UniProtKB/Swiss-Prot annotation:
Catalytic activity line of the entry: 4-CDP-2-C-methyl-D-erythritol + ATP = 4-CDP-2-C-methyl-D-erythritol 2-phosphate + ADP + H(+)
Family label: Belongs to the GHMP kinase family. IspE subfamily.
InterPro entries: GHMP_kinase_C_dom, GHMP_kinase_C_sf, GHMP_kinase_N_dom, IspE, Ribosomal_Su5_D2-typ_SF, Ribsml_uS5_D2-typ_fold_subgr
Record: residues binding ATP: P86, E87, G88, A89, G90, L91, G92, G93, G94, S95, S96
Enzyme class at the top of the EC tree: transferase
Protein name: 4-diphosphocytidyl-2-C-methyl-D-erythritol kinase
Summary of the function given for this chain in its UniProt record: Catalyzes the phosphorylation of the position 2 hydroxy group of 4-diphosphocytidyl-2C-methyl-D-erythritol.
PANTHER family referenced in this protein's UniProt entry, alphabetically: 4-DIPHOSPHOCYTIDYL-2-C-METHYL-D-ERYTHRITOL KINASE, CHLOROPLASTIC
Active site per the UniProt annotation: K8, D125
GO terms of biological process kind: isopentenyl diphosphate biosynthetic process, methylerythritol 4-phosphate pathway; terpenoid biosynthetic process
Length: 268
């Protein structure tokens, strides 16, 4: 079986306050983006044979192991993961990989396994990717409500500036806290091709600590992209294009400074 595991971007991210539990309450939109890892998943008589980054620590490996356990060890599987999405950049490739492995095994080895229970065990964004569409999220990003997003042309850019993800959160200050995102107005702005009334509260600390990031945004703005945001905790950025040729040409120009892809954001 072949599968495609699409990326996501956070189409706006607002840090609402610090919770009684010490994490930050978010309000954020998750939008699928068409850049996708390719997975080949095939049943075999025995064993779990996995090729991809991180070996046994890969979320998709853990997904397969959990599934086969839940299903009463119905047989083996061979999984090949070909990465197209950069890792640890706010794009959710690993979570998407794991979702597709769950869905593939569900088809290959039906056994009334509760995929969402497994996905919540795996955590991160696996429950989101199982939905196959956009979502509005609260809590720490895990409390989901489905959201229909208009499909629009977009560009994702990866500058190669990795820091541990807790850093950007530890750097957040009360002065960075925002209101809820105006969800309907953001959707309207996407469909109308306007500048969306969104923000990413994490850009507060991130641009203060890493001024290189403002240069990334400026470069994307100069190519005509609208609504340029760092995606979640970063460091990937996205921007909205006027049309598919514009997305392609802006992505091509950005390759001078890093990795870029033209695609579609939203769609379900």
């Amino acid at each position: 079986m072949e599968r495609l595991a699409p990326a996501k971007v956070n189409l706006g991210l607002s840090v609402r306050f610090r919770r009684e539990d010490g994490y930050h309450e978010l309000h954020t939109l998750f939008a699928p983006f068409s850049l996708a890892d390719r997975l080949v998943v095939e049943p075999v008589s025995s064993g779990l044979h996995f090729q991809g980054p991180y070996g046994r620590e890969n979320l998709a490996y853990r997904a397969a192991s959990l599934y086969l356990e839940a299903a009463g060890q119905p047989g083996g599987v061979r999984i090949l993961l070909e990465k197209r999405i950069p890792e640890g950049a706010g794009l959710g490739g690993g979570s998407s990989d794991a979702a597709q492995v769950l869905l593939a095994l569900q088809a290959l080895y039906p056994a009334e396994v509760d995929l969402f229970a497994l996905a919540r065990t795996l955590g991160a964004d696996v429950p989101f990717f199982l939905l196959g569409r956009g979502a509005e999220a609260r809590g720490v990003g895990e409390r989901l409500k489905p959201l229909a997003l208009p499909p629009v042309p977009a560009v994702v850019f990866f500058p190669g500036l990795r820091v541990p993800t807790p850093l950007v959160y530890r750097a957040v200050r009360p002065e960075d806290f925002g209101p809820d995102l105006p969800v309907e107005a953001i959707l309207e702005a996407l469909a109308r091709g306007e500048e969306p009334p969104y923000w990413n509260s994490l850009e507060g600390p991130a641009f203060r600590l890493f001024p290189e990031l403002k240069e990334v945004r400026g470069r994307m703005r100069a190519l005509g992209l609208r609504g340029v945001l760092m995606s979640g905790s970063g460091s990937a950025f996205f921007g909205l294009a006027e049309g598919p040729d514009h997305a392609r040409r802006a992505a091509e120009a950005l390759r001078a400074w890093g990795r870029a892809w033209a695609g579609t954001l939203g769609g379900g």
